[PDB]
Design a protein around this ligand. Structure first.
Ligand code: CU1
Length: 130
């Protein structure tokens, strides 16, 4: 499936997991939407999740700058090394982002939760595909 997916939905729970560790972005899409749904009962301050997509080579700086942006859902208003980012969502809440697929051609991109203590496990691969 490539010509029938301009959006994706990721489910995160308070058991510390994503329902997918691989996201394939179609270059057939002008923009790609990713919707995150936190299917749990824990509030964002106790077990919050976000989905940040950035260049893997720069992913370290993304997490680092994310921790410094605690007031802004652990996402820093910048979007230079970061391609897209959701907000922190609690049990029942959802957040979404829109990214330019053609910007993922720079190399290997990853998606992860920039919540301190989560990124070590809550991360995967996001690849631009045809
Ligand atoms: Cu998280």
């Amino acid at each position: 499936a490539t010509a029938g997916n301009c959006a994706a939905t990721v489910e995160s729970n308070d058991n510390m997991q994503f329902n997918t560790k691989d996201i394939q972005v179609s270059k057939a899409c002008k923009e790609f939407t990713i919707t995150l749904k936190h299917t749990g009962t824990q509030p964002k301050a106790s077990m919050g999740h976000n989905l940040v997509i950035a260049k893997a080579e720069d992913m370290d700086g993304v997490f680092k700058d994310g921790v410094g942006a605690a007031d802004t859902d652990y996402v820093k208003p910048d979007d230079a090394r970061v391609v897209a980012h959701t907000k922190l969502i609690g049990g029942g809440e959802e957040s979404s982002l829109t990214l330019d697929p053609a910007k993922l051609a720079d190399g290997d991109y990853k998606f992860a939760c920039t919540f301190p203590g989560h990124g070590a496990l809550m991360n995967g691969k996001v690849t631009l595909v045809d």
